[PDB]
């Protein structure tokens, strides 16, 4: 219904189109009011060494060799560009991943904004993970942002961590302020 690009990650696309990416952080950030459901037993991981993290949350008290988590990254975008084109690269970062296998995919808008989402399984560390990656390109005032969310879990924990993941993925929200 919308045709996807094949070459070039969303970030790479933006770089090339001249756009410039400033990572944001939550304290002091107010351009955009983003809800990130915190399911029960789940806590903000401080010091997550995830590069440009806005926030990371996780279920540490749960088990498995892999900790169920959600990562949220927010870049302010500097340069004129066209969101709808950008979004069409929304799937590529996920699809490059080793053994990627799609369960769901959509370029429908999210909370009024151009957005990609893709879900599926891939391999990391001789292990199979199940993840959900949404990118959304929000405008507040004269400013534009890339907001990216990943929700990940061992495949064996899908279902069992199910309500935690639904709640984040489906209750996730992004509003201008």
Q: Which descriptors apply to this entry?
A:
mainly beta; signal; 40% strand; 10 strands; eight-stranded antiparallel beta sheet; globular; two-stranded antiparallel sheet; 15% helix; Proline-rich 28 kDa antigen; 177 residues
Please report which band the strand proportion falls in: under 5%, 5-15%, 15-25%, 25-35%, 35-45% or over 45%: 35-45%
Strand count, sense and barrel status of the largest sheet are: 8 strands, antiparallel
Structural class: mainly beta
How much helix is in the residues?
Answer: 10-25%
Alpha carbon gyration radius: 16 Å
Order of helices and strands: HEEEEEHHEEEEHE
Summary, kept brief:
This protein is mostly beta strands.
List the helices and strands and how they pair.
Layout: H1 10-16, E1 20-23, E2 32-35, E3 43-44, E4 55-59, E5 68-78, H2 83-87, H3 92-95, E6 101-106, E7 115-123, E8 128-140, E9 143-154, H4 162-171, E10 173-176
Antiparallel strand pairs: 1-5, 2-10, 3-4, 4-5, 5-9, 6-7, 7-8, 8-9
Q: Could you explain the architecture of this structure?
A:
The PDB classes it as lipid binding protein. Keywords: Probable lipoprotein LpqN, lipid binding protein. The assembly is monomeric. With 177 residues, the chain is mainly beta. It has one domain. It has helices spanning 10-16, 83-87, 92-95, 162-171; strands at residues 20-23, 32-35, 43-44, 55-59, 68-78, 101-106, 115-123, 128-140, 143-154, 173-176. Strands 1, 3, 4, 5, 6, 7, 8 and 9 form an eight-stranded antiparallel beta sheet that branches. It has a two-stranded antiparallel ribbon with strand order 2-10. Strand 4 and strand 5 form a beta hairpin.
